[PDB]
Amino acid sequence: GSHMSVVHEGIWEPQIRNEQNVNVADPQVGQIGSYYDELYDSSRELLGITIGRYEIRYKKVGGAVLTYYSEDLFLRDGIIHAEGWADFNDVKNGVWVGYPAVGLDGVYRGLDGRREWRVIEPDQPVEARISLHG
Amino acid sequence: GSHMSVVHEGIWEPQIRNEQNVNVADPQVGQIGSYYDELYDSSRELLGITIGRYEIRYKKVGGAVLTYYSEDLFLRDGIIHAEGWADFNDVKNGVWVGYPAVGLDGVYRGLDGRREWRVIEPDQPVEARISLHG
């Protein structure tokens, strides 16, 4: 019946600044990073920016490295807060990761959903998608 | 191939103490509650306790009332931290809700998964399930 949504797909997301003490090969609990990325829509026009951080939080018996991300996305059409869990192994292996997102402003107000991304190439821009629903 | 899991299903979860300023009929953003529940396994033997809180955080255009829960479960076989989102409408309507959980101690250490529950009857014990995986 009734559906309201805002979807941005085929995002090209270059990293403008990032600092971290995360051992990429062998991450240790308590290591962190902070980042400032631009986002470009599928037409490589500017969509906005994200500012965020992440922390290696725990390891599972099966080897997953559970990492907690928190960020704010300031886009042409509104503002989104996104935070949650990713397996750092999925990150490194170019698997799609992501976590819940809530609209704060503009078209996203009263919506929520997910902020997702994947590595294509180490130290190359990431692919991202944003999908929020009423 | 390889699977490690701890599952407790058919939990009977009576409320021992709870205080709140949540308007159940018409919840307002910023209202909270805190609770202390016992859990009994499907044999109505004691499994342990949970101590937690919840907060009405935001409303969606479609009418969902997004509520943030945080708790700690102290069980016979270990300790679990669980927190995340539920639609307060799903809660009131006896729909299954729940959110991520991580093992801190005993059999749950190095596992994660979900803590879930549903209302059977207002002011009657809830049904719960716990499912963590390696």
Residues 6+ apart with CB under 8 A from A25: none
Q: Which of B32, B86, B85 is nearest to B56 (CA)?
A: B32
Chain B residues inside the 8 Å CB shell of A100: 85
Are A100 and B112 an interchain contact pair (Cβ–Cβ within 8 Å)?
no
Q: Does A134 touch chain B (CB under 8 A)?
A: yes
* Largest distance between two CA atoms of chain A: 48
Q: Which residues pair with B99 in a beta bridge?
A: B115
Residue matched to tokens 């009994």: B40
- B60 touches A: beta carbon within 8 Å: yes
- Reading the block at residue A97, the tokens are 């990761």
Residue with tokens 């910023």: B30
Give strand pairing partners of B85. Answer: B68
Rg, Å, chain B Cα set: 15
Q: Is A13 exposed, middle or buried (0-12, 13-18, 19+ CB in 10 A)?
A: middle
Q: Which helix (H) or strand (E) holds A107?
A: none
Please judge whether A134 and B61 are an interchain contact, meaning their C-beta atoms are less than 8 angstroms apart: yes
β-pair partners for A49: A38, A74
Q: How far apart are CA B54 and CA B115, in angstroms?
A: 14
Which residues of chain A does B133 touch, with a Cβ-Cβ cutoff of 8 Å? Answer: 62
Q: How would you class A86 by CB atoms within 10 Å of its CB: exposed for 0-12, middle for 13-18, buried for 19 or more?
A: buried
- Beta bridge partners, B133, equal B5, B112
Q: Do residues A38 and A14 make contact, with C-beta atoms less than 8 angstroms apart?
A: yes
For residue A77 the two structure tokens come to 């059409």
Residue B3 to chain A, least CA–CA distance (Å)? 8
Q: Can you tell me the distance from the alpha carbon of A130 to that of A113, in angstroms, rounded to the nearest whole number?
A: 8
Q: Do B62 and A4 touch (CB under 8 A)?
A: yes
What one-character-per-residue DSSP string does A61-80 give?
Answer: TT--EEEEEEEEEEETTEEE
Question: With a CB-CB cutoff of 8 Å, which residues 20-49 of chain A face chain B?
Answer: none
| Closest chain A residue to B1, measured at CA | A62
CB contact under 8 A, B85 and A66: no
Among B5, B57, B58, the residue to mutate for chain A (most A Cβ within 10 A): B58
CA-closest candidate to residue B54, choices B89, B81, B38, B30? B30
* B50's tokens: 């949970």
Nearest CA in chain B to A1: B62
Query: Distance, in angstroms, between A72 CA and closest chain B CA?
Result: 17
Q: Measured between alpha carbons, how far is A17 from A131 in angstroms, rounded to an integer?
A: 25
From chain B, the residues in CB contact with A112 under 8 A are 58, 60, 66
Give the C-alpha distances (Å, rounded to integers) separating B103 from A35, A45, B75, B86.
Answer: 29, 44, 11, 21
